[PDB]
Ligand binder design. Sequence first.
Ligand SMILES: O=C(Nc1cc(Nc2ccc3c(c2)OCc2ccc(OCCN4CCOCC4)cc2C3=O)ccc1F)c1ccccc1
Ligand SMILES: CCCCCCCCO[C@@H]1O[C@H](CO)[C@@H](O)[C@H](O)[C@H]1O
Ligand SMILES: CCCCCCCCO[C@@H]1O[C@H](CO)[C@@H](O)[C@H](O)[C@H]1O
Length: 339
Amino acid sequence: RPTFYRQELNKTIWEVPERYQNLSPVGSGAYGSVCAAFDTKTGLRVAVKKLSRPFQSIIHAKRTYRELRLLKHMKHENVIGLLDVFTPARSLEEFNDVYLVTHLMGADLNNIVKKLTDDHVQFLIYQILRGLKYIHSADIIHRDLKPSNLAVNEDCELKILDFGLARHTVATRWYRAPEIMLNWMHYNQTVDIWSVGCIMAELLTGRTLFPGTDHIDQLKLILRLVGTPGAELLKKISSESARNYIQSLTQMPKMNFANVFIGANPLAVDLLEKMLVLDSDKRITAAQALAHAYFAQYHDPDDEPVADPYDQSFESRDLLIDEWKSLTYDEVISFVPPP
Ligand SMILES: O=C(Nc1cc(Nc2ccc3c(c2)OCc2ccc(OCCN4CCOCC4)cc2C3=O)ccc1F)c1ccccc1
Ligand SMILES: CCCCCCCCO[C@@H]1O[C@H](CO)[C@@H](O)[C@H](O)[C@H]1O
Ligand SMILES: CCCCCCCCO[C@@H]1O[C@H](CO)[C@@H](O)[C@H](O)[C@H]1O
């Protein structure tokens, strides 16, 4: 067991092993805060996330376990990976803090918002899709893919995060598939493809594709581009609510993408058409997307791995805070560094 040292940073205390030196806030947002640090053991710059109030409620407790489980499972170059997980706690009894350690990338994608070259886009989107392929094959939907959940280093290497930064040391709806806002019962994986579509579009135009002021506005903007649902899509809408609002709207046609994405690489345009289909069953999957001609210079089908099966059974479990806590504690304890 390493030696820990305390340190007040933000308004919070960081009790980290000395192994990690020179902590400095990158900022924070939803569910914790992150410090850049130096890993004296690997010589590598790392990001250290301290979970905020990891066991506040059953919900936080479960969210903390879910993140630890997710992270411990993600073993892919385009997906945030766990270098280390530790807690000051010597025992389950005093376990109330969780620090997750990952590679410091140094930037996220709204950090290039203030138009990329087609080659940069191409490379970034490839990497997103490559990470998504992997994520999706573990039966995991990200559901919140947006620029801030995409960490990029100086080499333009990208890892998908689920904890984006909000405070650095301005809207989530802009990337969400339309179904997520019609509050659909069950989302499929290609909700994430839609967000990629939005992300790609934004990288090529330097403009937020659907900068909806709200969920109604958002949906209005989406339909403006992709046109109202055809009766084939309508057929699949159980929500009499949704179905009502939908077929009452302006019957917009699908725009010509080649015209909206003027002078974009027509390969990119074609991928965007594939990604930004309202009907999620008809959206290109991340795997299919990796094959698309747009990524010919990056696509390698023998190096686009899928994940080991991810045991998501816990998600349906309703447990006591101390059970989530103790399950998280077991996860912290069972953790084995990458080689
Ligand atoms: O990804 C999940 N959990 C999870 C997320 C993170 N999140 C990270 C990590 C890294 C980074 C980051 C967010 O934000 C983007 C960013 C922005 C700026 C920056 O450096 C800018 C400041 N520099 C410092 C050095 O150079 C001079 C100034 C670095 C980074 C960065 O590198 C960290 C650990 C986790 F554990 C998850 C997964 C599943 C479920 C729930 C959450
Ligand atoms: C490492 C990158 C993978 C991204 C984490 C995917 C999270 C998938 O897990 C999901 O999280 C949702 C919100 O996060 C919850 O509402 C869902 O119940 C849960 O299934
Ligand atoms: C104007 C609102 C139109 C939005 C239509 C969203 C349709 C997304 O696609 C739908 O996803 C469902 C699961 O999420 C699937 O079960 C359906 O097969 C698929 O049609």
